Scaffold this active site. Structure first.
Site, mmCIF file in Angstrom:
data_model
loop_
_atom_site.group_PDB
_atom_site.id
_atom_site.type_symbol
_atom_site.label_atom_id
_atom_site.label_comp_id
_atom_site.label_asym_id
_atom_site.label_seq_id
_atom_site.Cartn_x
_atom_site.Cartn_y
_atom_site.Cartn_z
ATOM 1 N N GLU A 1 -5.651 -12.902 -20.926
ATOM 2 C CA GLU A 1 -6.823 -13.374 -21.662
ATOM 3 C C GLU A 1 -8.079 -13.356 -20.795
ATOM 4 O O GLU A 1 -8.823 -14.332 -20.714
ATOM 5 C CB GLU A 1 -6.561 -14.772 -22.211
ATOM 6 C CG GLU A 1 -5.326 -14.877 -23.084
ATOM 7 C CD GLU A 1 -5.070 -16.294 -23.556
ATOM 8 O OE1 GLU A 1 -5.906 -17.176 -23.269
ATOM 9 O OE2 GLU A 1 -4.033 -16.526 -24.212
ATOM 10 N N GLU B 1 -5.274 6.596 7.446
ATOM 11 C CA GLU B 1 -5.599 6.529 8.864
ATOM 12 C C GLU B 1 -4.695 5.512 9.544
ATOM 13 O O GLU B 1 -4.666 4.348 9.123
ATOM 14 C CB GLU B 1 -7.056 6.153 9.065
ATOM 15 C CG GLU B 1 -7.616 6.559 10.417
ATOM 16 C CD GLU B 1 -7.326 5.537 11.495
ATOM 17 O OE1 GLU B 1 -7.181 4.343 11.157
ATOM 18 O OE2 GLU B 1 -7.238 5.926 12.677
ATOM 19 N N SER C 1 -12.328 0.860 -2.134
ATOM 20 C CA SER C 1 -13.762 1.052 -2.001
ATOM 21 C C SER C 1 -14.124 2.499 -2.293
ATOM 22 O O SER C 1 -13.560 3.422 -1.699
ATOM 23 C CB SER C 1 -14.225 0.664 -0.599
ATOM 24 O OG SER C 1 -15.618 0.877 -0.448
ATOM 25 N N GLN D 1 -9.674 2.016 4.297
ATOM 26 C CA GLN D 1 -10.041 1.243 5.477
ATOM 27 C C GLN D 1 -10.746 -0.039 5.070
ATOM 28 O O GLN D 1 -10.413 -1.128 5.551
ATOM 29 C CB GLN D 1 -10.926 2.071 6.406
ATOM 30 C CG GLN D 1 -11.173 1.420 7.760
ATOM 31 C CD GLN D 1 -12.331 0.443 7.755
ATOM 32 O OE1 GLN D 1 -13.281 0.590 6.988
ATOM 33 N NE2 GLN D 1 -12.257 -0.564 8.616
ATOM 34 N N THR E 1 -10.406 7.645 2.006
ATOM 35 C CA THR E 1 -9.067 7.498 1.446
ATOM 36 C C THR E 1 -9.097 6.707 0.146
ATOM 37 O O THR E 1 -8.314 6.975 -0.771
ATOM 38 C CB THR E 1 -8.138 6.830 2.458
ATOM 39 O OG1 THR E 1 -6.835 6.673 1.882
ATOM 40 C CG2 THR E 1 -8.675 5.467 2.854
#
Ligand SMILES: Nc1nc2c(ncn2[C@@H]2O[C@H](COP(=O)(O)OP(=O)(O)OP(=O)(O)O)[C@@H](O)[C@H]2O)c(=O)[nH]1
Ligand SMILES: [Mg+2]
Lengths: 432, 48
Positions: free
Chosen positions: A247, A64, A133, A11, A138
């Protein structure tokens, strides 16, 4: 002939990225519908459709329906490809087990096929970008499962993940410490670079320079979106001194285990105030190392530094860049580790940052985004480590987890790995 | 041998002035801390 594939999951993951495209889109002039109004530097983040509008190189996955289905009815309804928006049916519900052992499997199979199809069009695949996150359900599961699967199929391609961690004191969920420890374990042995973008720290930047007393999630992302553009700046524009996506994990990671770091961006000035500061390169770089300006709520003064990669985007003359760098070493508040005498890899770009209309950013003609690996990172790991000790002390909340197919001892092994990580950094910092 | 507010007080009136969201989002209303540029130069080099 060099391409990057962007992956968004969670989310927040769908929300964190969304700030990236509108900024990226407005840089090359592509309208929302994709038709080019009026050289070929855009191939780095887009793919031709053979005729007409373009197609971005991204895939949206989130279990979701609501968050993903939000984009299906917005003004961007004419930009994203239809069938690459894989959507689930039931959400992970903040349970670390559901999103990686119970429901995530039935949709990941779609994920691999889509990603495989997208790459086949390309020929110069430089690396992957994944947003996930750790503070969300999820993201933890789908993020971990995808990471293992992606590595096996492709292998040595570079991977960079813009994970967002919980703040030291401010938090949203109540089980954030668990998924963080579980998610962190998986991401340590499969990723080449991971960044720190703790939400609270970005709050401070908003309230000091911009002085926005009422900032929301819409505003936070743009500043994050800016960081993404700057890092890839020397990848799709002409520049006197360029740095390749390959790099970056070549000059930043000193040892195989340590693959983390925290970044910062500046200068961040509003229009009503930009009338008073020249924004000289000699000074702007100064704010780069200012402890307040670090994007992560961490103390850069509690340890030593390993290496600093600073990409300069703007009109800076090469002479000044060298001139300001030496003065940095003089300061006694910033001390380098004993085993790295020369530790600055400076990149210079030409195209200035672009201003998203209606945003906080005011058009500034010298910008810098710094990625440096510092020994202070162990603090966030240590503090989060303390959280896990208290809750599991009486195995509170453990019942929800073994109820989806995860073994009880899985948490036993998770802590040991982090314990090694915490010890490892202290080992590095010791002078010879 | 009881006014209109007999359970429906949870909603009423709410002029278009109150409907507007809060005061200012992502925007500093302070005279010197705002983001709107001056009319003299609606877009231009903001530095040196
Ligand atoms: N910076 C920022 N972070 C966000 C935003 N929205 C969600 N997050 C992060 O997401 C974490 C919680 O997960 P959510 O994004 O709400 O949702 P999720 O990760 O997909 O997990 P589910 O809700 O189960 O689907 C929080 O800790 C936030 O850090 C946002 O708009 N801005
Ligand atoms: Mg979610």
């Amino acid at each position: 002939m060099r391409e990057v594939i962007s992956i968004h999951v969670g989310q927040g993951g769908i929300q964190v990225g969304n700030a990236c495209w509108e900024l990226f889109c407005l840089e090359h002039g592509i309208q929302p519908d994709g038709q080019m109004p009026s050289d070929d530097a855009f191939n780095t983040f887009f793919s031709e459709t053979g005729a007409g509008k373009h197609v971005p190189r991204a895939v949206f996955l989130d279990l979701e329906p609501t968050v993903i289905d939000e984009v299906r009815t917005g003004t961007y309804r004419q930009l994203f490809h239809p069938e690459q928006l894989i959507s689930g049916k039931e959400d992970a519900a903040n349970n670390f087990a559901r999103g990686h052992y119970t429901i995530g499997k039935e949709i990941v199979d779609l994920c691999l096929d889509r990603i495989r199809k997208l790459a086949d069009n390309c020929t110069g695949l430089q690396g992957f970008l994944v947003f996930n996150s750790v503070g969300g359900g999820t993201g933890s599961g789908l993020g971990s499962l995808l990471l293992e699967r992606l590595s096996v199929d492709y292998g040595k391609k570079s991977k960079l993940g813009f994970t967002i961690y919980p703040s030291p004191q401010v938090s949203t969920a109540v089980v954030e410490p668990y998924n963080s420890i579980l998610s962190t374990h998986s991401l340590l042995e499969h990723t080449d670079v991971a960044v720190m973008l703790d939400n609270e720290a970005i709050y401070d930047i908003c309230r000091r320079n911009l002085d926005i007393e009422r900032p929301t999630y819409t505003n936070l992302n743009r500043l994050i979106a800016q960081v993404i553009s700057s890092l890839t700046a020397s990848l799709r524009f002409d520049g006197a001194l360029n740095v390749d996506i390959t790099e970056f994990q070549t000059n930043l990671v000193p040892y195989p285990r340590i693959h983390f770091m925290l970044s910062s961006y500046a200068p961040i000035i509003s229009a009503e105030k930009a009338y008073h500061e020249q924004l000289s390169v000699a000074e702007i770089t100064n704010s780069a190392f200012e402890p307040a300006n670090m994007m992560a709520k961490c103390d850069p003064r509690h340890g030593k530094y390993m290496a600093c990669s600073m990409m300069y985007r703007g009109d800076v003359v090469p002479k000044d860049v060298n001139a300001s760098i030496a003065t940095i070493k003089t300061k006694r508040t910033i001390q380098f580790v004993d085993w790295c005498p020369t530790g600055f890899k400076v990149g210079i770009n030409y195209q200035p940052p672009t201003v998203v209309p209606g945003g906080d950013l005011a058009k500034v003609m010298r910008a810098v985004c710094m990625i440096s690996n510092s020994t202070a990172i162990a603090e966030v790991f240590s503090r989060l480590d303390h959280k896990f000790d208290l809750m599991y002390a009486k195995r509170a909340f453990v019942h929800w987890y073994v109820g989806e197919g995860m073994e009880e001892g899985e948490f036993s092994e998770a802590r040991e790995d982090l314990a090694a990580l915490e010890k490892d950094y202290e080992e590095v910092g010791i002078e010879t | 041998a009881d006014e209109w507010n007999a359970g429906k007080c949870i909603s009423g009136e709410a002029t278009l002035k109150e409907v507007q969201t809060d005061k200012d989002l992502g925007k500093t209303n302070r005279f010197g801390f705002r983001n709107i540029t001056k009319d003299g130069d609606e877009n231009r080099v903001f530095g040196v």
